[PDB]
């Protein structure tokens with residue numbers, strides 16, 4: 414009944430310059446997957462919401478404040494604090510696929526590295542065979558996860574931490590509070606604090622996801 418809560422139906426945003434974005438929202442948080450065409454500029458802006466982002470595919474020139482970093486897929490993240498100007502350019506011959514999370518909570522303090530970009534904090538197995546990679550700031554933890562094929566599983570559990578995520582490769586069955594969805598590329602899920610969730614990958618190919626914790630769960 415409430416599947417729309419945990420797995421929001423995305424809206425498509427189609428710009429005139431060719432950028433396409435898929436918007437999923439639950440309450441105070443929005444997830445956007447963006448496809449930016451070759452040699453295309455994304456005009457700078459600013460807003461009261463904090464913004465965290467990462468490249469999923471391709472290479473993107475990302476600008477936050479005075480800083481522009483060439484972002485390689487899945488190897489860095491950025492945080493644009495509230496009202497900090499930010500924009501981007503796909504300066505390559507290839508499409509960029511990027512992810513960004515926009516958010517505003519009254520009790521959160523949106524710190525960031527002084528030059529805005531986060532590098533890999535640590536890579537390691539979360540469960541035997543399940544490799545994860547962390548990017549860590551005070552109030553948020555990004556965790557890349559690979560769920561092995563042929564039965565790879567994240568057992569059901571709950572935690573104080575809010576947890577939001579998006580599938581970025583392969584497929585898997587995701588369950589939140591008794592609602593099971595077949596995740597595919599771009600599918601987003603939203604877990605409020607203490608909401609039951611789990612996952613299994615029954616396919617042959619491993620499945621990749623980006624999972625985000627407020628506040629950090631593993632590296633505090």
Ligand SMILES: O=C(O)C(=O)Cc1ccccc1
Nearest residue numbers: 558567576610611612622624
């Ligand atoms: O570590 C957690 O808290 C998780 O929920 C991990 C996870 C990884 C991939 C899909 C669903 C949950």
Ligand SMILES: [Co+2]
Nearest residue numbers: 458460464499
């Ligand atoms: Co923005």
Ligand SMILES: [Co+2]
Nearest residue numbers: 570572576610
């Ligand atoms: Co969890």
